[PDB]
Design a protein around this ligand. Structure first.
Ligand SMILES: O=c1[nH]cnc2c(C[N@@H+]3C[C@H](CO)[C@@H](O)C3)c[nH]c12
Ligand SMILES: O=c1[nH]cnc2c(C[N@@H+]3C[C@H](CO)[C@@H](O)C3)c[nH]c12
Ligand SMILES: O=c1[nH]cnc2c(C[N@@H+]3C[C@H](CO)[C@@H](O)C3)c[nH]c12
Ligand SMILES: O=c1[nH]cnc2c(C[N@@H+]3C[C@H](CO)[C@@H](O)C3)c[nH]c12
Ligand SMILES: O=c1[nH]cnc2c(C[N@@H+]3C[C@H](CO)[C@@H](O)C3)c[nH]c12
Ligand SMILES: O=c1[nH]cnc2c(C[N@@H+]3C[C@H](CO)[C@@H](O)C3)c[nH]c12
Lengths: 238, 240, 240, 240, 240, 240
């Protein structure tokens, strides 16, 4: 066991879906997997393993923000043999053409965190997803007739930002959604030589102020989950 | 409600103890407070309000790392009228003379986060506790005969750091414990005009490799909790 | 006319292939395009427009390094209506699994340049290609039976670097090739609302020392050219 | 013996009061210590040793600015065996409720200098005073009925700042005074394993433009001296 | 041969004039040198060697921007035995009193590039010319009755800058011209132990918007060439 | 009067020589100027005005380090009408061919200070001397048969540096002397539109350990004083 995960090697599948909300992981396990079993619950950070169409798949919360998800992702990779991480998150939109409930896929993630500069000799690391995982997710979406935008996320350090003018800069630069984790997840994946992807559902609009309820974020973002799960199967086939 | 707390204004006391672990907050509420009631549970981040020797006090988890605790601390101050935050955390020691289960108090907190540079025009903001809160914590510890070191914490971004040589730099500079939150909490406190303090129990020795179990971290760090709660009463005194 | 391009609006197609070397552009126009006409030659930076399998396409050199290519790409987009840029470059390999003449596609581009920090309030801009352009290139490669790797490039400021230890960091982080341009091109595309992709042919192995000749770089990297041109046709398909 | 101090080991007490102004050091020695003797004068930077209530105490100027004071503080600690440094300085107020002649105590010191980034791998070092020294000064002030604010100083590089908008930022973040030294002194004390504290008298109001005369700064800031001296005796107590 | 220069040792003189434009190099070689022969042409980057009043002199393009010119200048110095580089460039004026066709000499060059930080442990390297080269050029100009301003250039990374407000900062600080190369050439010269100088003719006024044609930049900036060539002879003198 | 200078407009000449050490300023005034009178003495920072060969000249200490000298030089320029500042300092050598007592001239000054980044939007300001002042000083030296090196100083923040490996980088980049002021003085001069120069006598060798005494630094660096004063008269010449 680790300080953060009360599980043993083998308890996780080699692919893990990760929302920041452990109650969304519970929702995913109970409603999309067969034979689901809870495998960890330290700090209430619930993780589960079950099967989807014959395929062993895990789902586990990562908490909010880069330093939180970095602990969980690093442990899964280095202690539990995990090969692929798919973050299944929420995000706030800054572009007028991107609506609440749209699904976006972060091929890259910008950030105002220092973590990748710490890794990368204070130069610019382009925090990117694994291409084949991006392609598999886009393809899974198309097959279900779900529209997705593939582009840059922005992984924010401060949800309550003292610099809101930066949202306009994000919009100008084509950022598809604001969250707080992907750039960190992609940094860990590169560091440890694993593969990662972040898929998010727009849960609020930073410009219009439109919101979803805590309950909707927890229980109703089903399209991203279907896309994520199908993309796992597509990945196995190639 | 806010996106992260399903409570109403008035539901929290004006002072809140905050461990990173919502199960530690549950433990504190159930074992140290009278009249305890759970006031929130979004994302499993449990928060409670009760009384300690008659004084209304809340306790709530803040999650791990600066971006997480910044969310919760900001909301408590700006949305729930909270005046004082006492982080009751764990930490790793870098100094050979600081032992697992030692209690330390962060008058200041160093960090490798960018959050305070973002706030402070890319200059060095010294992330500090409120002085009277520090003094009250130290004097609560003295009364109970619990030894404490008061000094600099280091709030790390990366628990699994790619730069372990930094630990010896921290030690050379007198850092008393490594955690992942205080510098962010002190930044929010200054930005929003409130007061904060971080008190931590050493749960790991970073030099030797010693690590307490998950369960120990959750339910057995009683000294810091006693100090924290007594410090609230001390700090309430007229003219303290 | 601009200071760097003596051409008229309309003289370029809405897609432009850009090698660093204006003589590689000449090679491409003369050997891969039909009815090519030279449209510019300021500073010996040759550009041409012709057709490929009926589709109007331009090819123009961008010189070496981020500041050079930034000028040409910016002008093409803002002054010449160009919508899509495909850099067709060379690069150095840092991974021993990657060989001279391998073709790599930069879905992202790391850099030690300050240009994106200048644009992006000193934060980390993830300099990325347009996804549909990456997909079209990878599919064009497959249709030709050409192996490719899709990953991070590193756009270097100093070819003669004072810090060769950085190559090992690049390799550890999975950089598929070192060049000097993509991160700048991707920054311009995003700043000006256009689309870009960099495909490169490995021309040097930085670990082993293998180095192709100038003539080889100029006239013999055909596979990347084939992939770029084919990818334009794929990218044109309605609904792609 | 050192390039900046023409004294011998033993000439300084283990506690040194340090104003920036060597003439304020002379004022202090002549008016607050008994039997003070001058022990150094290189570069006109006067230092003295005498007794206060029989207790050996030194006072010596440190010049203006982080690089100047760092030289002197470093030498005192590493070459003259000094254990505690109490800066007795002036400062400019940025908060309207803070007045000329108010005494402030720097539990922390923010800065726009690069010196601590140089020491601390380019991370944020929270430049803090020694806690017991803060507490002793605070308590000495209360015993004399002198109000003091305990909080963050801001140690500035440029007295004539090109960025006066930063003063508004300091005020919003609760900075109690602007001086030019504490963050550097605190950085030295941590690097060399000693203890330090900065106590300052407000000599300038940065918002209103009020400025005391050079005469006043040199010979009339008596309260901070009384507090500093009393705090030495308080801090000497075995179990303090 | 190198990947950028198809010449051998001995093909270049020990002093090389370098415009960014290889066609300006051709112009110089054809009209100001005797018996100029073309010694390289890779990537269309023309270089020539002839004589001026019997003295062996080379002229070669360096392309646009710091990363491009760094390649060529580094190769000339380390692979071709070159001792002195004289950039003969264009530049944009930011001062009202500096006019198109004025000749300026960069004793130093500011920059927004990261290259010298990369070289100089992230500190500030003052990118400066060789003093005697500055003196020879200034004296050559005076002997010709040509007025020159000697001061700081600014070597820009982005010609199409997203921060035009920086031009006013340059003007306030006395920058005599903005180009894109000098700070990088000066860093290479210092890194490799050679000597360099940048002399530039104002081709654009950034404040007034006035411009010259590409043809003018290429074929008509004669005063800087005459000054540069005269300065080589002056600088050759024993005891200069 | 200012808080740092107890003099009135007119008390200073329009050129001021400035050592860091106010006792060296006294020495210069008493032994090199005619009819010198002391014009200021706040914080023991002695300043004087007299004549050299009939020319009105001032000499005043600036203290140690960039923040200290920035105060005095800024006041001299903006409050006392000063046009030219000649720092007459000491420095440490890092190159094995530069010896104690050699005289060097800082045409540029590198620095690890943040001051010019603060001024210059976080870019690289090349902190340079005024060209005619450098030329006049070099030519004054030659006329006295005094050999001088003209190049980059390094203005250090931390005399007791925690990074002595930086000295090798300085040597590799051709730094002629290490002091603690020039880069600051040059930035002030540029900010306020005045002119400055730093001439320094090597007072110790950072590589070999060789030193000079406090008394030698104060009273025996005559060559640099003679050069500085002579350079004033040369610089006054019409048309120089
Ligand atoms: O406005 C926003 N800023 C930053 N992140 C988010 C997200 C995505 N998640 C939600 C959660 C903070 O609410 C953190 O894990 C990032 C939704 N909306 C926003
Ligand atoms: O070894 C350590 N490194 C960094 N932080 C901590 C802490 C403090 N908390 C505990 C939790 C990570 O275990 C995060 O909220 C920071 C205990 N031990 C260590
Ligand atoms: O070894 C290398 N380092 C950096 N870039 C390149 C490239 C790519 N191009 C080629 C050209 C430098 O030769 C510049 O445009 C970058 C090939 N090899 C290397
Ligand atoms: O207005 C101010 N700005 C910055 N520092 C100070 C100080 C403190 N000291 C005084 C002295 C500059 O006068 C230097 O040692 C810093 C007093 N007033 C001000
Ligand atoms: O307006 C300008 N900004 C930056 N550089 C230049 C130059 C000097 N050269 C010209 C060329 C870019 O046109 C590049 O090599 C730098 C002339 N005008 C300007
Ligand atoms: O070794 C050295 N490091 C930095 N500066 C100096 C100097 C020049 N002055 C002397 C003085 C520090 O002793 C400060 O004003 C800079 C001489 N030697 C050294």
């Amino acid at each position: 066991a680790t300080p953060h995960i009360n599980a043993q090697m083998g308890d996780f599948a080699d692919v893990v879906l990760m929302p920041g909300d452990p109650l969304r992981a519970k929702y995913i396990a109970e409603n999309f997997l067969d034979n689901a079993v809870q495998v960890c619950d330290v700090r209430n950070m619930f993780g589960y393993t079950g099967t989807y169409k014959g395929r062993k798949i895990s789902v586990m919360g990562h908490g909010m923000g880069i330093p939180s998800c970095s602990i969980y992702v690093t442990e899964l990779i280095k202690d539990y043999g995990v090969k692929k991480i798919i973050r299944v998150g929420s995000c706030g939109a800054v572009n007028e053409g991107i609506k609440v409930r749209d699904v976006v896929i972060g091929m890259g993630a910008c950030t105002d965190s220092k973590v990748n500069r710490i890794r990368f000799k204070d130069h610019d690391f382009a925090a990117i997803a694994d291409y084949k995982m991006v392609k598999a997710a886009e393809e899974a979406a198309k097959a279900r007739g779900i529209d997705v935008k593939v582009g840059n996320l922005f992984s924010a350090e401060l949800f309550y930002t003292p610099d809101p003018s930066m949202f306009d800069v994000m919009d100008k630069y084509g950022i598809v959604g604001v969250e707080m984790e992907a750039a960190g997840i992609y940094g860990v994946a590169a560091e440890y030589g694993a593969k990662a992807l972040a898929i998010c559902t727009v849960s609020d609009h930073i410009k219009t102020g439109e919101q979803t309820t805590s309950e909707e974020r927890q229980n109703t973002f089903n399209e991203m989950i279907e896309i994520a799960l199908d993309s796992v199967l597509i990945g196995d086939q190639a």
